[PDB]
Amino acid sequence: SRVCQVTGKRPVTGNNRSHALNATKRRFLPNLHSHRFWVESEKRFVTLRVSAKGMRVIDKKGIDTVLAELRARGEKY
Amino acid sequence: MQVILLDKVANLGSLGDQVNVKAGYARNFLVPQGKAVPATKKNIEFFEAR
RNA sequence: UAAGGUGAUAUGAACCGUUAUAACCGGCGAUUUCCGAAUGGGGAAACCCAGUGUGUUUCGACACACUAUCAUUAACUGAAUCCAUAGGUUAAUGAGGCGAACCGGGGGAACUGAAACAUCUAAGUACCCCGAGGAAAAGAAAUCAACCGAGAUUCCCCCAG
RNA sequence: UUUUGUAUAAUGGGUCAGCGACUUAUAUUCUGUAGCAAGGUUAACCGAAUAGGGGAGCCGAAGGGAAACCGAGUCUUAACUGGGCGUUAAGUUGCAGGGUAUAGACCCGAAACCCGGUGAUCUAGCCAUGGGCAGGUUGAAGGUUGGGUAACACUAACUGGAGGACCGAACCGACUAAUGUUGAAAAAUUAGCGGAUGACUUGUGGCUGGGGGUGAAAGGCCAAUCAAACCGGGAGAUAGCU
RNA sequence: GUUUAUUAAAAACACAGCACUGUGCAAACACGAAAGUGGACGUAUACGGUGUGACGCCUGCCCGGUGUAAACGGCGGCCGUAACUAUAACGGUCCUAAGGUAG
RNA sequence: UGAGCCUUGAUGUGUAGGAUAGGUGGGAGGCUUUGAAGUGUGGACGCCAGUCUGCAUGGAGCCGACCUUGAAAUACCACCCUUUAAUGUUUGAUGUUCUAACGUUGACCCGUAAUCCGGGUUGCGGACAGUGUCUGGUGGGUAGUUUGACUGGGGCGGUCU
RNA sequence: GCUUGACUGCGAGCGUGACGGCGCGAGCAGGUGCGAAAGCAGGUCAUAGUGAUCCGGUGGUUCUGAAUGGAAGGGCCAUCGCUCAACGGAUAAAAGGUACUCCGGG
Numbered sequence: 001s002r003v004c005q006v007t008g009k010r011p012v013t014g015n016n017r018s019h020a021l022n023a024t025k026r027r028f029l030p031n032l033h034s035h036r037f038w039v040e041s042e043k044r045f046v047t048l049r050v051s052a053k054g055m056r057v058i059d060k061k062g063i064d065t066v067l068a069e070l071r072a073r074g075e076k077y
Numbered sequence: 078m079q080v081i082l083l084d085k086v087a088n089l090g091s092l093g094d095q096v097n098v099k100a101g102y103a104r105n106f107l108v109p110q111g112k113a114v115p116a117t118k119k120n121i122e123f124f125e126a127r
Numbered sequence: 128u129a130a131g132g133u134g135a136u137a138u139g140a141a142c143c144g145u146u147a148u149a150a151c152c153g154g155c156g157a158u159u160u161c162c163g164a165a166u167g168g169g170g171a172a173a174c175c176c177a178g179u180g181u182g183u184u185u186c187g188a189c190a191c192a193c194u195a196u197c198a199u200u201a202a203c204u205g206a207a208u209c210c211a212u213a214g215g216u217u218a219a220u221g222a223g224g225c226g227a228a229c230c231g232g233g234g235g236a237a238c239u240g241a242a243a244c245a246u247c248u249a250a251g252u253a254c255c256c257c258g259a260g261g262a263a264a265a266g267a268a269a270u271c272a273a274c275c276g277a278g279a280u281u282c283c284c285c286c287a288g
Numbered sequence: 289u290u291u292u293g294u295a296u297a298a299u300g301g302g303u304c305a306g307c308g309a310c311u312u313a314u315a316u317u318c319u320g321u322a323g324c325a326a327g328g329u330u331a332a333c334c335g336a337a338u339a340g341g342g343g344a345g346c347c348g349a350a351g352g353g354a355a356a357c358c359g360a361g362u363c364u365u366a367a368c369u370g371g372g373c374g375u376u377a378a379g380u381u382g383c384a385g386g387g388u389a390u391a392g393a394c395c396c397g398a399a400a401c402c403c404g405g406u407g408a409u410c411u412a413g414c415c416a417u418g419g420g421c422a423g424g425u426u427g428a429a430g431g432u433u434g435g436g437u438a439a440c441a442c443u444a445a446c447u448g449g450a451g452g453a454c455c456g457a458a459c460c461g462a463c464u465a466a467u468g469u470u471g472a473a474a475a476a477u478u479a480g481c482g483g484a485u486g487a488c489u490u491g492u493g494g495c496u497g498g499g500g501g502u503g504a505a506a507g508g509c510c511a512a513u514c515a516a517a518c519c520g521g522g523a524g525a526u527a528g529c530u
Numbered sequence: 531g532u533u534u535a536u537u538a539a540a541a542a543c544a545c546a547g548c549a550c551u552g553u554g555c556a557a558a559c560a561c562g563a564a565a566g567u568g569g570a571c572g573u574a575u576a577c578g579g580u581g582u583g584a585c586g587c588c589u590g591c592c593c594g595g596u597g598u599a600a601a602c603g604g605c606g607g608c609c610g611u612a613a614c615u616a617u618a619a620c621g622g623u624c625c626u627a628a629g630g631u632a633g
Numbered sequence: 634u635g636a637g638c639c640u641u642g643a644u645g646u647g648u649a650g651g652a653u654a655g656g657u658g659g660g661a662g663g664c665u666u667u668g669a670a671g672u673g674u675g676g677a678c679g680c681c682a683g684u685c686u687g688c689a690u691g692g693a694g695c696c697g698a699c700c701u702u703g704a705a706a707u708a709c710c711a712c713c714c715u716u717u718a719a720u721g722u723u724u725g726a727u728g729u730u731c732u733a734a735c736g737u738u739g740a741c742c743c744g745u746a747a748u749c750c751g752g753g754u755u756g757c758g759g760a761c762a763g764u765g766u767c768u769g770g771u772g773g774g775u776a777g778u779u780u781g782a783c784u785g786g787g788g789c790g791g792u793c794u
Numbered sequence: 795g796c797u798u799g800a801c802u803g804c805g806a807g808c809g810u811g812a813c814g815g816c817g818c819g820a821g822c823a824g825g826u827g828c829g830a831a832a833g834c835a836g837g838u839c840a841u842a843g844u845g846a847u848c849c850g851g852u853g854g855u856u857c858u859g860a861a862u863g864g865a866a867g868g869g870c871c872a873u874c875g876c877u878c879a880a881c882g883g884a885u886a887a888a889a890g891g892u893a894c895u896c897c898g899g900g
Contacts, residue, residue: 002564012233013233013234013235018245019886020245020246020777020778020886020887021245021246021247022245022246022777025234025235027563028765028766029563029764029765029766030765030766031764031765031766032764032765033735033764033765034735035104035734035735036734036735037108037109038109038110039109040109040111041211042211042212043208043210043211043212044211044212044213044752045751045752045753047751051765052765055104058104058108059078059100059103059104059108059115060115060116060117061115061117062108062115062117063108063109074198101733101734101760104734105733105734106733110733205744206742206743206744206745206752207742207743207744207752207753207754208743208753212752213743213744213751213752214743214744214745215744235403236401236402236403236522237401237402237403237522237525238400238401238402238522238523238525238526239525239526240526241885242528243779243884243885244777244778244779244885244887245777245778245885245886245887246885246886252522253402253403253404253521253522253523254402254403254404254521254522255403255404272861273861273862274861274862283331283332283333284331284332284333284344284345285331285332285344285345285346286344286345286346288315354857354858354868354869354870355857355858355868355869355870356856356857356858356859357857364803364804365802365803365804366802366803366823366824367803367823367824368803368804368805368822368823368824369804369805369806369821369822369823370803370804370805370806370822370823371804371805371806410535411535452531452545452546462539463539474536475535475536483531486531487531487532487544487545503533504531504532504533504543504544504545505532505533505534505542505543505544506533506534506538506542506543507534508533508534508535509535512535512536555738556736556737556738777887778887778888779887779888779889780888780889780890781880782880786900787900793879793880793881794844794845794879794880794881794882794883
């Protein structure tokens, strides 16, 4: 699924409004990317489907306190 | 951004400095490969103490 | 509680009991075939096909307790790869399924009106999906009001069509 | 019943018995009746529960102007001889009835749109595994010999058994004629007809699902139906029509 | 051969042959919100899309707009040329790229 | 290589002139023999008046109102405008190097008696490829735009206030 | 010849139309013009010379002002932009040609 594993962002339904205001359903897709991480503690290359905003969050915080709450809510890696 | 280096990487570092570097350097040289620490406003003062 | 009774179509037959073990009515306990979450493997439902420990004064074949899946924890093992993970097995706990309405959440139309029609509308309605309980949700102000002040949330009647 | 006009040959009823159509809920207006009267009335709730309490609130007795504002006067204008709108003339709460609007709103009756499921046991196409094609006739490549050539080319027998070959059984299909048209049968029968060793046909199992599938292409078929299947729901959709 | 099972079997559909365009592989293209699959366990003598419809005489001229036309297309005037007309294979022109060939 | 910028220093004639002196502000003591005014050109600006500085004639004065200038200090101290020079910071174009992002439907090894998947190693491309957000253009291939009313069997063609 | 009465605020009452509209309009108050004066002038001898509503432009009105004073926005007055020519004017939003046409009827 296209779920940001760190921030919780998922696609929601929106509308592409026309000049005649014709409603058409569309989903906003988050800028999600798979990137590999190297944990020195467990000696393994872990990949995570995160957003770029999730990348900025994990640059602010760090990988360890993010994994500390990735092990919490049933996530798998 | 505000990551502090630890190694003898090329000329923007002097065994630790607060710099303003691009995002690739921080994530894809410094996040999980080593040689730095994130700027959590606590680790920077901790390594200022060290 | 009892002189009646062995449910009914439904008689008949064979009987039990009558002063305390007939039947009727209730609580508890056990048995609870097979299919069906169905759970040892499969499977076209009430079927087919196996293994490990325990038992045969008839130790051939078989019955008994098991052996489905997932999540977490613990233990034992355990790769490239030193360290260590991943992986495998076992123990324990919980769940899988059904259920009329109610609740929270995620998707969610058109018919019709506008006497045409696209904004709007119908409508977050019908319908689908996930979860929980006797209620759910919400709930103790970064809320209102206007210089007086109100003091968590919930439901009803006004204000107010 | 509809029509200017119906016995009209414009529509409907074979008959009888039973059922069946101007209602419900909420606002607003009018009439009659009923209490109180410049006052009338309670909603939620409490409650010995249609009692009583409870007047939060609503209407009216004052209106004008868009409004501030002014006020039995107000608006306009610099102000009116003025002009428009009002003033001392009773309303309110009940009940019943006649309308209006909202809803299916007197009753029955569309082509269509969307949502959730079910069907490839019929047919269209594909895949995997099996089966069938009586009989006769014509005779391709290749092999051998002879005629002919310096030798092939070309030619005459025999062998050979190829054909999206021919005639014609089962089988497949329906071009003609006839019957059947309240059928023997919701497409068949009778006699002729075309293929019938192939682009043939068939048994079994699976796959392709509806705005889609499939299609040697007719807009054919998808369970006796298809210019968008069936079932359930929005839906008692909408009608200016009968 | 095939088609409107149940009012139309053909001049309709299909058909080998011929031709054009595109695709260099993780292919073009298609079913798929994605994974994946077909194409294809194939590799420009292969594949997809399109047009025509055996075969013979044969496909003549033109690349200006979107060298290549069997693509989207075009093939008009003036005179010259095949025994007494007309038509003009051919050779100039109007710079608009060039003008109906055979039958 | 083009544009901005941080620091270092020059840079500015109404006209004569010890000298091409920018603006408002303090100021009566500073330097040179650790070699000075005053004169000269080369590259350089030019109204060819000269100045900047490398060089150089020279070996003892510059200076403060100065005896000159409409405006006085290159005695000293400050934020500055224009021109212009240096490395470097910042942002773009061009091409090269990388190997870490990323892709790998190349090969090998392990989980694994597995053509899935995950990890490692290696190679190839490579900051492209591909993706999210916003936006310009193209696009009767598709849809909504619905595209009006009066007319005597009739061929033309009009009319609307 | 002289002048702006083609001025504002009005206006009883009327005709004609379903209405809006149009038309005459005695006369009040202020301020004007002509004429010596009495008096007349609120456009054109009359019947056609017209575009309403919405939106936008311009100025004013201290009228309101989502805590206060502002401000924004709204309201009122005057005016302008439409062959809305289909002209008492349906929606922000279609015109056409079939000489590329086809079906049904008389």
